[PDB]
């Protein structure tokens, strides 16, 4: 129950637990790979549970480097901030999420994703191109720890494109106790013609836990993610 019928329309699609399917076709320095993911999102708690399988064999990059690529419509927007939820307002027709991810002293990922409903299922369809990576480096050399760290990301409207932009840094732990920086540039634009909610400046707070399925022999990542919006007060 919200005063704004635009907010009601978005909230209605994300009542209860929504099934998620993730598809990624990837090419990093000519290593071609595919990832499939399945799980559930619960926007009420900002909670995602996903299991990803590399369907082409061994993943040629470390799993932690793909967490941000592999669905911000499951973010928990507090009641006083629901007018600022671009991600749900674009559904069900969906949104494009584009990134460039710069790995300091290494290569970059270029990603393009379509996030939309197919019936009751929320689908994230991604293409990833990776170029200029070092053979011996932390990424292609698999020197990252299998873990993730809490981070905040500031969201700004881009009035011109009727979308949003975000720039933010992820620090990946290297197995020697150093850090690999990953500089993220992000833009989102709606797929539909309809109006969307353009937000005031705010931030998303994210926690992620990575685990393994002890019965799974395929190369895989189990992901538990919480995302909460913050930074506008009552």
From Swiss-Prot:
Q: What is the effect of changing residue 151 to D?
A: In Cerulean; leads to improved quantum yield, a higher extinction coefficient and is 2.5-fold brighter than ECFP
* Listed result of changing residue 201 to I: In mut2.1; shifts fluorescence lifetime from 3.03 to 2.50 ns
Gene3D superfamilies, per this entry? Answer: Green fluorescent protein
Outcome (variant: residue 148 to C): In mut1.9; shifts fluorescence lifetime from 3.03 to 2.74 ns
What does altering residue 158 to V do?
Answer: In EBFP2.0; shifts the excitation and emission spectra to shorter wavelengths and increases quantum yields compared to BFP
Q: Result of mutating residue 82 to R?
A: In Topaz; shifts the major emission and exitation peak up to 20 nm
Q: What is the effect of changing residue 170 to T?
A: In P11; increases fluorescence at 475 nm excitation and at warmer temperatures such as 37 degrees Celsius. In Esmerald; leads to brighter fluorescence. In VisGreen; leads to brighter fluorescence
Result when mutating residue 36 to R: In mut1.28; shifts fluorescence lifetime from 3.03 to 2.76 ns. In mut2.2; shifts fluorescence lifetime from 3.03 to 1.94 ns. In mut3.3; shifts fluorescence lifetime from 3.03 to 1.88 ns
Stated consequence of mutating residue 227 to R? In Azurite; shifts the excitation and emission spectra to shorter wavelengths and increases quantum yields compared to BFP
Q: Known consequence of changing residue 148 to F? A: In Sapphire/H9-40; exhibits a huge Stoke's shift, with an excitation peak at 399 nm and an emission peak at 511 nm. In Azurite; shifts the excitation and emission spectra to shorter wavelengths and increases quantum yields compared to BFP
Uses described in the biotechnology field: Green fluorescent protein has been engineered to produce a vast number of variously colored mutants, fusion proteins, and biosensors. Further generation of mutants led to more stable proteins (at 37 degrees Celsius for example) with brighter fluorescence and longer fluorescence lifetimes.
| Effect recorded for residue 71 to L | In EYFP; leads to yellow fluorescence, folds faster and more efficiently at 37 degrees Celsius and has superior solubility and brightness
Reported effect of changing residue 205 to F?
A: In H9; increases fluorescence at 395 nm excitation
Give the result of residue 178 to G, as annotated.
In GFPA; leads to enhanced fluorescence at 37 degrees Celsius. In Venus; leads to yellow fluorescence, improved maturation and reduced environmental sensitivity
**Gene Ontology BP terms:** bioluminescence; generation of precursor metabolites and energy
Tissue and organ expression note: Photocytes.
Which UniProt key words apply to this protein? Chromophore, Luminescence, Photoprotein
Q: Which family does it belong to?
A: Belongs to the GFP family.
State whether it acts alone or in a complex, and with which partners, per the record.
Monomer.
**Name of the featured protein:** Green fluorescent protein
Q: Which organism is it from?
A: Aequorea victoria
